[PDB]
Design a protein around this nucleic acid. Sequence first.
DNA 1: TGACACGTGCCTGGAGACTAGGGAGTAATCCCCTTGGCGGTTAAAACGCGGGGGACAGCGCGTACGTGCGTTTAAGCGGTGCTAGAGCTGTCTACGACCAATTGAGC
DNA 2: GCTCAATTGGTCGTAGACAGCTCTAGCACCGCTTAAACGCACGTACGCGCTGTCCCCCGCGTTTTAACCGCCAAGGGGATTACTCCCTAGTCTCCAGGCACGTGTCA
Lengths: 107, 96, 92, 91, 77, 78, 89, 94
Amino acid sequence: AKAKSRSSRAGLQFPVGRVHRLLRKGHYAERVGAGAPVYLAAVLEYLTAEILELAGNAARDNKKTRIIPRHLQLAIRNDEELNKLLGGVTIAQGGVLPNIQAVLLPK
Amino acid sequence: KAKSRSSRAGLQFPVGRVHRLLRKGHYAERVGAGAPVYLAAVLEYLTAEILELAGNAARDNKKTRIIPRHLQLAIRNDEELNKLLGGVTIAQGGVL
Amino acid sequence: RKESYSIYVYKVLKQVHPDTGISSKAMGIMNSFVNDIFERIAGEASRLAHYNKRSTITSREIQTAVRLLLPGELAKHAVSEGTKAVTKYTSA
Amino acid sequence: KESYSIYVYKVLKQVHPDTGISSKAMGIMNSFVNDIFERIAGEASRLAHYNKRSTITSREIQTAVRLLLPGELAKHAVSEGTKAVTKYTSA
Amino acid sequence: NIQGITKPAIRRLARRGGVKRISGLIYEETRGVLKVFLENVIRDAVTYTEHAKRKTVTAMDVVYALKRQGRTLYGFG
Amino acid sequence: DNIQGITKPAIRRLARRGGVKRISGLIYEETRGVLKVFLENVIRDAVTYTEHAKRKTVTAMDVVYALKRQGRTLYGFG
Amino acid sequence: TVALREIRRYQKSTELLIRKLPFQRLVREIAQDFKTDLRFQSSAVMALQEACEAYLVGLFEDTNLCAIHAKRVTIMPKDIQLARRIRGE
Amino acid sequence: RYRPGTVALREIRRYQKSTELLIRKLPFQRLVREIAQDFKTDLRFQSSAVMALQEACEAYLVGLFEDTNLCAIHAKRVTIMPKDIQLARRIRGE
DNA sequence: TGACACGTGCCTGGAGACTAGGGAGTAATCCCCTTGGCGGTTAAAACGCGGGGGACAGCGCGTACGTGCGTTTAAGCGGTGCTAGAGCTGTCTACGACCAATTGAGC
DNA sequence: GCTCAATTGGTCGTAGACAGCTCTAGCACCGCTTAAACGCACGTACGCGCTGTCCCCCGCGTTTTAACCGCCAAGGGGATTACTCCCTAGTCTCCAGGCACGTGTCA
């Protein structure tokens, strides 16, 4: 009778029950089947880990140890997949990539 | 004796059907009585707006039925319908 | 059954241009047009209702959705038409 | 209030065990998660009615993920999504 | 089959766009761009066809693929 | 006449971040006219939201929503 | 001399400009890689053709201005490449 | 004295590396009210709302200059001129 | 040095259980529209000739842009002062969801 | 022609309209400091106007080939239907995950 979380069952860190409630209360459908929130939580955790890996690598690549928005921007615009997904996002304090056009360099 | 709510507002568009769509569409859990009358009135105004220009185009062509070429000739001449439907493209509509 | 707006577009056309007929193709275009804008307005009203934390769609929500969605003159007339409609409906 | 700020930390500790995160980047992560959540739920919500069904099942999420995500993200996301579900149903 | 999109057809389409004079190299680029557009739309269409478990691709699948790609098409429902 | 407060140096520094090496002297006024329109389009939405809520103080989430409608989703402030 | 009259004719007219059979075979060729032995409804190919020709017409309309900016009369490949780059395609 | 056009490269390499806001705060702070007063009188503003407006505007202008430089390159110039902005905006659709 | 990390009280958001009932998994018959094939003809596509127009490299040149030193001005940071108004609390009734019986607008 | 879905009548649960209270932070003012903008100067790099020339596109003609039309076969699978059942919402309990608020030390 000892309660144990559905996230622990699924091997997930993200909160399965909170996702399930957000679906049920979001007006997205009249019913929400029992497998939908586990799948969605796993998908979100994958994308989170994919971002944070690249952010940590950019931190080491700048000899910093604290991730900051510059590192997120570099983690996103230096991947041809993440950049296709995050097409409309503007990131505050993110700045830009270094990319001068070769036409304009000295002769 | 029933007098249909569209006739009470004097609209042509069906306040019944529109309220059925608003309820069945899961937009929100409750829908108050002014919403479907207001929405039907707006949709009727926009329909009359488009049809007026389409008929004017047909009359200038010396024809009598509006055909899609006439609809494209209408929408692409109005400086505000071309903002509402800027991304929409019309089958057989052609170009100016 | 293939429920449609076509028999209402017929009435509006007859009111605007009593001599003028309509092809099946323009009817399909008009019906798709109405089934588009209906969804756009109802969706935008939905977002306004949730950002205020209200249980209810009311004519204020539809009015503000129209004001945000439609360009200037179309909105300016349509708001006056909707207000005149809802007043005279309340008068009955 | 509600935020994801515990779980993003719990993931960071697994993936980079030295590193910390500023709360200013925590807010960016939280908004990103809410964005992707709303996209996936929206597109899953379409497929139900396009098929004239009342429910959302795992098939709707699987298809919305395949449509929204690019191919190389989609293959792995779907793969371990089915892994997680297979564990859940086998537990 | 891409060489089945004839040079006259590309010329007619560019003429509808008002191009008066057309370089001899435009044709292979136009074929490439048409092919990548078609491939994207057909992928999305078949993805809807598969989720519906249908074997026929319907006009609704194309209309939805076009809408999701951001270009609304009227007339086909 | 505060629009002049976007000084010429500011437009130069902005164009420099975009990689522009050399700038013609009329670019500044066109940039100011472009900005004025973009500001008016965003504020007209934000003020509509502020009025519908019957607040008077315009709030940052109102601008987040205005940008989300106009397709320029902004992370970080909400 | 004739090209301007051709422009008038094809802008005034409303027919489809790509022959049907080759476009249909191209579509069925492409589809095969995603699922085998599909069928296509008769109108599905019409919807695809009505999309693709309008898309190219718009691309050529943009390409024309991209050419005029160079003070050229003729459109060239790099005009299409610029158009797609600025359009963000 | 450096010859022309070398320092522009150092400026670009700096301002692309840094993340500071390039517009002065207080003048834009006043400008926002001088506009909004046309829409309602005696409006009042959160500091965060002005900071969000500033971030959006600087992102928009940098995004427009990145496209505008391609027009100059395509014409084989290096000076951006107003017709480059006009063309870029006309193609972009705004 | 002051932002993040570790600690505490605590409470309402999650989990285990049973009931109820209807959405959709299922197996079948159908019939219509898609695929396949024929003759044929003549619309459009393809190959050659001819040339003069549009593209463009070399050149001249000058005016518009940049890089610098000095003047100043209004921006930036800090302090006190305050009271409008966002935000929470307590109350209660106007109204909008659900069921039924009816019959006519729409297909 | 005829049917199913919109209309009118009633119940009644509640959430949102009104009034109060509050304590946050947005507005206003004082001053000091000086970063940044503004002005003037001139040197030279780039954009713009012109010439000569050239090769590759436009326009005409004859050939030819396969797109198209129309009729005939037939059978795969979209569509509808009746049955069933196992799945998920509603309710209730009860308990611990993580939320305000605090503290301090090192990137």
